[PDB]
Amino acid sequence: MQSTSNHLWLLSDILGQGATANVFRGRHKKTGDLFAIKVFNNVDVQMREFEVLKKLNHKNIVKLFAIEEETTTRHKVLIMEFCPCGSLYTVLEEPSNAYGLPESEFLIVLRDVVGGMNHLRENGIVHRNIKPGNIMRVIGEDGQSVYKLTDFGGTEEYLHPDATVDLWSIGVTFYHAATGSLPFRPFEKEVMYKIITGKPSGAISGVQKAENGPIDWSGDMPVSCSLSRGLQVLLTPVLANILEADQEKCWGFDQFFAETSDILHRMVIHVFSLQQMTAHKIYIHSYNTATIFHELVYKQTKIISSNQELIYEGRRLVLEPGRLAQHFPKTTEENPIFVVSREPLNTIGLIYEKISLPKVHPRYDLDGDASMAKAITGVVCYACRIASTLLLYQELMRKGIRWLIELIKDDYNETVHKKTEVVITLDFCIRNIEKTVKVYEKGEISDIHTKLLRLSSSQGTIETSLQDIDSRLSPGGSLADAWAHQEGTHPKDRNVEKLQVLLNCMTEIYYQFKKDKAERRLAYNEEQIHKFDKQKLYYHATKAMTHFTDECVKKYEAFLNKSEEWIRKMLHLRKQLLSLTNQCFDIEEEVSKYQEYTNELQETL
Amino acid sequence: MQSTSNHLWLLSDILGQGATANVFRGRHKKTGDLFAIKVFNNVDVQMREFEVLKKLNHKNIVKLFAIEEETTTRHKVLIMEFCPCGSLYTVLEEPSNAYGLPESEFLIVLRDVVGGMNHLRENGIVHRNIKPGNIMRVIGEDGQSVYKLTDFGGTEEYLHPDATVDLWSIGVTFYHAATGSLPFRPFEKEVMYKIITGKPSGAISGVQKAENGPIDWSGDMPVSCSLSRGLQVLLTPVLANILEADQEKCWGFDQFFAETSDILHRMVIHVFSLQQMTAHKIYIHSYNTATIFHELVYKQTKIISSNQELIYEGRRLVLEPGRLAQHFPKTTEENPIFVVSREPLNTIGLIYEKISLPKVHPRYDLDGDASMAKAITGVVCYACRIASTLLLYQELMRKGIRWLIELIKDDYNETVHKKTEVVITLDFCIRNIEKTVKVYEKGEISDIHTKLLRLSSSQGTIETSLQDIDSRLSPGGSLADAWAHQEGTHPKDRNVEKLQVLLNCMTEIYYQFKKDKAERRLAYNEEQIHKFDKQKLYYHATKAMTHFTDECVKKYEAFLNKSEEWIRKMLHLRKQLLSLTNQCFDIEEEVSKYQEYTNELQETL
Amino acid sequence: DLPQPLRSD
Amino acid sequence: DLPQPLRSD
């Protein structure tokens, strides 16, 4: 081991090698607290650099405690705080993050990197171009991660291909965090320049799949990007304006900080469009009215603001247009605000990428096995995530259907008793005026009596139409939701846990291969166990991807195909009921005036 | 290492020592699959025993594959399937299970142990008295645990204190799984007999806290038992009738199997009593009607069947009494069926045990440190579980209040428009009969007119009472739920995750102490790091138990104290509205007959 | 390439 | 009883 005047560390504790220094895990000699010790191996310029960096204090900067001296040799050490969870490389090498971070973790990364950038620029420290190795991770005091910046002042794909802050590396870091792959990929330091130089405007990625072929340019996030559409619309102009090929037209830092702070100060409202079967995340400020909420729902569900009918926990929801967005009800992903229209739409469903398993290569290649295990485990993790999303859509669909039938029945009942009131008034006016004429006679009498007989015949038509509508809405009729508990997948079938067991077995084999890759060669029995695990991994992958596409996707497509025709039948019934309600209001508008003239003729004679 | 003709194992793989055999983890020589090998160290009686046990096949029996012979020495081995997750001792030594298993895991243990007992008895295998070391655990193909029985055919507390199956050890196993402690505990093999011999009827535990003092006998599960009340009522007679002190009066196996199968075939319905703020789990068969459901709600919430008003997702719930219990709606713990009455009750809340931290002992005792770490981590785990339960009660309380106000407003609105209808009819009858009398005169007339003037005055009182009720139900009035978003704890405060971080640090120190207990003595620096961890554990425990009782319990008691007076105000308003509705029905019942007599007097003159 | 059975030697 | 500081010897 080695030591300083106040710290000591064992040399079998190497947190990091490097051509400049070595980072060990050591501990304070009198209190036992852990630290990371950076030992150099080789002057007051760098001492004044570390003295300026010592005075910083922020929750996104790794603290430098003290700079001391080795006791055996006269080297320099830096004592800094110990971040146990590794850097952002270790976050992005997990197989669940092989197709991009989840959206909450992505927003945490975005917030903390931009906050560290701002606090370094505001004091005046000229730093490097930060990459995913300069971003450490720590577990905060409330479970959430906290990302910190360190070492400011393949590691070569993140640079621009040539005092002012350059923002290419931050853009490639955020595209890599959002999707899991680098934006500009040649096939298999001049090809990079030839790709990025001939890049069009607005393009944020370019893929080359052949040798020296043309480059497929793209302007959207890929289909296997886990970020919601409401965030991709806010995030794609930022990455389109900082990954610009010409440095004159980029943003610089103040416009970038203002636009990312406009992204970060939004709240989220979860809205599940029922006729399209699609969930949405509307990002809105805390001080916007309901008018901007209706415009944001229009931009994603294509429903005009005068047709959006909102449902929240049973009853309807009537947002008056002066209601601020911080006084909306609290929504989660499993408790959304359902949007139903009256005019027809297209039932889309969930749009996901079709990912297949790669071909396993049969040779005993001890470096290729770790890459094969990582790629196959990433495919099965993507399938598990899509399986849970499909189950969530089916459950919200069943709940929204069950609420919408009750709202239809309430409109039915108020129409029924309003009609019964108009019926009582009509029959009284008939009986009154006819008794008065038949007694008084020992003009406009036929003009009254013919029209009121017409109204009673119209009433007779309205009543049998209401009987037919009750015959359809009855439990056991044509618009009952007894089919919805008999298709799709239910949470008692436990499909996601069955994928998760196979996924845990595959992740264990992946960790064993990655551990066996660091040791250069193995013994006899260890090599045989390695080969048996190599084929058993692919057996688990075949089993899980058969279960996914023959238990989860097929039943979902059956459920979607029935939901389409249920929505068509619902829209037909809900239009006919509105026609009957308007006809009853027309009869009431006539009956009022005729009743007035009847009562006047009663009083004058 | 050692070997057989088809299996091999390294000797640094000892799954278990014993005075009879040694259990190693080995693997099949041609396919690489893992097995557990039991090597004896010492005849056809036991060979025929193992041949009879070889033919069994059940999902609660550990499979015996083959019996073979060591190649070096001529010993015997048993190859059986490898259960990686350990026995039930390893399940009950976890600090989260220090006060009993969760209820779902307890029902899994109960089902699988009784199923293994039945399948062994039905074939005719005479086995031992099974204890928690004879119950292995495996992870099934869908995430749930599967408990299996092995080795049939402090380990001495589970025996009776003296062909027919004895059931004392099963009873002590289930009491230990439910509560985490043995039922009969002397203080610090004759005292056990003197306690259990003088045991009264029905008692399932007896605690002695002094030297040779009297024994506190109990007939209930303790207050820190995590099992719900609806299960304790079903489970306490079983344990009271198999822990009987006299072997003549015990059940035997058929009555025990029938009663535990009556427990195991129940479904669960989650019901949250709102006026008492208590959640309940009603256990009901799949073929019972709604009448038995109302009787089971009466037995726990003390609400008579003619007063239970049920609320489920917004609207009410009217269970017709011929509706089977498998056609009820599906409920979870976060989606219950709310029960509200009209007559007052007592707001109880959650009843939990007050557990404090034990005194840390300052001496360097390397066996006492593991016990101290286990006991302190068990206390903080119990506190984390109670914190999550308190947060669940506050969230369900906020949701039930928000729904109940809407139901009150719906009763208000139907009363209002029914009254407006009766007002129109009354004013027409007044105007008609008075115009007819004033014109006809160029009897009972004052008897009509005085009474109808009384009815209009009564109407005038009804209208201002309805205006006062709308003034109270208005947003911003006296019966608004604006207080409920300003007290208690919210899920955005993240108190449970703040306890969970401290709990993870404490569990890591506990595992390090348990690892250091197996090594008999330590070096210098290792002993110093041990002492610093010993005091840092108690620092984390003090921090977590201060945060619990000053952030979680105090805000909960404020929320409970406001909910009591809100429930009192709600019951007062909801009674006055019913009085107004009945008065309007009385006025309508009078107005109908008076209108008939008015119309007859219109027609006759 | 293919796995061959284990041995104790 | 009480922890004393570490050493490298």
Domain boundary assignment for chain B: 1-82, 83-264, 265-344, 364-605
The owner of tokens 């596409």 is: A549
Chains in contact with B, where contact requires at least 3 CB pairs less than 8 Å apart: A, C, D
Q: How does strand A216-218 pair with strand B34-40?
A: unpaired
Give the integer Cα–Cα distance in Å for A16 and A54.
22
Structure tokens at B470: 């709308």
> B363 — contact with chain D (CB < 8 Å)?
yes
Candidates A477, A339, A345, A315; CA nearest to A411 is A315
For residue B294, list its beta bridge partners. none
Give the integer Cα–Cα distance in Å for A8 and A72.
12
Using alpha carbons, list the distances in angstroms from residue A220 to A97, A101, A167, B231.
20, 17, 20, 55
Q: Are A101 and A178 in contact (CB under 8 A)?
A: yes
Q: Tell me, what amino acid is at B207?
A: V
Give the integer Cα–Cα distance in Å for B175 and B183.
7
Q: B498–A435: do the CB atoms touch at under 8 Å?
A: no
Q: A30–D8: do the CB atoms touch at under 8 Å?
A: no
Q: Are A29 and A46 in contact (CB under 8 A)?
A: no
The helices-and-strands tally (H runs, E runs) of chain A is: 13, 17
Using alpha carbons, list the distances in angstroms from residue A350 to A2, B173, B377.
58, 49, 45
- Burial class of B524 by CB neighbour count within 10 A (0 to 12, 13 to 18, 19+): exposed
Give the integer Cα–Cα distance in Å for B564 and B597.
51
| Secondary structure (3-state) at B227 | coil
Q: Are A488 and A558 in contact (CB under 8 A)?
A: yes
Q: Are A504 and A497 in contact (CB under 8 A)?
A: no
Q: Are B54 and B80 in contact (CB under 8 A)?
A: no
| B229 contact partners, CB below 8 Å, separation of at least 6 | B280, B281, B300
- Tell me the nearest-neighbour CA distance from A537 into chain C, angstroms: 14
Using alpha carbons, list the distances in angstroms from residue A336 to A269, A318, A331, A393.
8, 15, 5, 11
Query: Looking at B175-249, which runs of residues are DSSP E strands?
Result: 184-185, 205-207, 216-218
Give the integer Cα–Cα distance in Å for B331 and B362.
50
Candidates A528, A496, A533; CA nearest to A514 is A533
Q: C7–B29: do the CB atoms touch at under 8 Å?
A: yes
CB proximity under 8 Å: D 1-9 to B: 1-7
Candidates B197, B204, B202; CA nearest to B175 is B204
Instruction: Decide if domain A364-605 falls under CATH 1.20.950.20.
Output: no
Instruction: Tell which CATH architecture fits domain B265-344.
Output: Roll (3.10)
- Tell me the nearest-neighbour CA distance from A393 into chain C, angstroms: 44
> A3 — contact with chain D (CB < 8 Å)?
yes
Phi, psi (5° rounding) for residue A104? -70, -45
Nearest CA in chain B to D4: B528
Candidates A252, A180, A176, A245; CA nearest to A217 is A245
> B315 — contact with chain C (CB < 8 Å)?
no
Give the integer Cα–Cα distance in Å for A369 and A476.
58
For residue A340, list its beta bridge partners. A309
Candidates B204, B170, B207, B165; CA nearest to B185 is B207
Burial string for B330-363 (b: 16+ CB within 10 Å, else e) reads ebeeeebbbbbbeeebebebeeeeeeeeeebeee
Candidates B558, B570, B511; CA nearest to B369 is B511
Structure tokens at B602: 């219109």
For residue B268, list its beta bridge partners. B283
The owner of tokens 């449970």 is: B496
- Tell me the nearest-neighbour CA distance from B32 into chain A, angstroms: 6
Q: Are A337 and A325 in contact (CB under 8 A)?
A: no
Note the maximum CA span of chain B. Answer: 134
Please state whether at least 3 CB pairs lie below 8 Å between chains C and D.
Answer: no
Q: Tell me how crowded residue A500 is: count the other CB atoms within 10 A of its CB.
A: 19
Structure tokens at B20: 């009879």
* Residues from chain C contacting residue B2 (CB–CB below 8 Å): 8
Q: Are A339 and A273 in contact (CB under 8 A)?
A: yes
Structure tokens at B523: 């070096």
Q: Tell me how crowded residue A284 is: count the other CB atoms within 10 A of its CB.
A: 21
Nearest CA in chain A to D4: A30
Please state the three-class secondary structure of A357-410 as a single string.
CCCCCCCCCCCHHHHHHHHHHHHHHHHHHHHHHHHHHHHHHHHHHHHHHHHHHH
Q: B435–A603: do the CB atoms touch at under 8 Å?
A: yes
C8 closest CB neighbour out of B3, B30, B32: B3
> A435 — contact with chain B (CB < 8 Å)?
yes
* Residues from chain A contacting residue D9 (CB–CB below 8 Å): none
A341 CB-side CA count, 13 A: 20
Chain centroid to Cα A538, Å, comes to: 31
* Residues from chain C contacting residue A537 (CB–CB below 8 Å): none
Q: A315–B313: do the CB atoms touch at under 8 Å?
A: no
Structure tokens at B260: 């535990």
- Tell me the nearest-neighbour CA distance from D7 into chain B, angstroms: 7
Instruction: Tell which CATH architecture fits domain A1-82.
Output: 2-Layer Sandwich (3.30)
The CATH number for A83-264, chosen from 1.10.510.10, 3.40.50.620, 1.10.10.10, 1.10.1200.10, is 1.10.510.10
Q: Are B38 and B78 in contact (CB under 8 A)?
A: yes
Q: What angle do CA A255, A257, A258 make, to 5 degrees?
A: 65
Method: cryo-EM
The owner of tokens 């990455």 is: A239
| Secondary structure (3-state) at B307 | coil
* E strand or H helix at A27: strand A21-28
Q: What angle do CA B21, B27, B33 make, to 5 degrees?
A: 135
A539 CB-side CA count, 13 A: 8
Give the integer Cα–Cα distance in Å for A131 and A95.
20
DSSP state, A70?
-
Q: Are B410 and A413 in contact (CB under 8 A)?
A: no
Q: C5–B27: do the CB atoms touch at under 8 Å?
A: no
> A595 — contact with chain B (CB < 8 Å)?
no
> A362 — contact with chain B (CB < 8 Å)?
no
Q: Are A564 and A403 in contact (CB under 8 A)?
A: no
Using alpha carbons, list the distances in angstroms from residue B243 to B129, B173, B223, B268, B310.
14, 11, 20, 27, 40
D8 closest CB neighbour out of A3, A30, A32: A3
Q: How does strand A14-16 pair with strand A7-9?
A: unpaired
Phi, psi (5° rounding) for residue B176? -70, -35
DSSP state, B329?
P
